[PDB]
Amino acid sequence: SVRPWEFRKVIQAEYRERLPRNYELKHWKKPSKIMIGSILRLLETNTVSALDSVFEKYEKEMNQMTHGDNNEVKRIYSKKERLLEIILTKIKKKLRQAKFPSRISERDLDIEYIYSKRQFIQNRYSQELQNNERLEAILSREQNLLEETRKL
Amino acid sequence: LSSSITSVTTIDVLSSLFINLFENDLIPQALKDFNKSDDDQFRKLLYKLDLRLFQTISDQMTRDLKDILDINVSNNELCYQLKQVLARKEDLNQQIISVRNEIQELK
């Protein structure tokens, strides 16, 4: 019964299929603009990429069906662009209207965020490892001193 | 892995949402048109373009959401490793203090 365009329903069913019944699936919230924006930017990126991909692949068939009229080809490109934007517009409308568990971190869907977090945590890890290396050396020095002192 | 499991799941839910939309709706409808268009060779080609366009977008969406999932899962592990190194740091500091105190009293 659930149709692919009913995003609110699909999303709630998918969560329920994947995770046990517990508190996390009890409060629900509409998504943030950056979640919507991140997802639509992914969709737009791939839509432009697909358009170029596909039109280049079928260039000869295209040019042979338009009898060399490259203006008509640009027109067909624009028609397909318009079809995809109308689709993406409904995707955005239905996603804005869907709900997600409130404990999720929607910024996890933003490549800018998770990329900048990863660079920082990698650097922080390297700094702390070196600090522990140094503390291990200091501790060793002190433990040697204690062993000598225990023997007077 | 429980603090992040609902956020990781969100990425999979979205990936499944768009596979369902493209593979179980947009692409079947474009096929239904393309199979029906043997009289108009132009519209047959254009429906084929729709087919390829939806399949390309859907496959690439899945790959990019898997990228995002892999980044998050890897980041979460690094964050937990950082917690362990910081726990060890605090312990090394305390042990250094205790050993120094011991030397001070035995000296």
Binding site: E112, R118 | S74
Partner: peptide
């Protein structure tokens, strides 16, 4: 290949859009 490689490639492609 690497996660960072893949991450940077996605970041670049999304920034090049709009």
């Amino acid at each position: 290949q690497s996660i960072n490689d893949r991450a940077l490639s996605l970041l670049q492609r999304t920034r090049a859009t709009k």
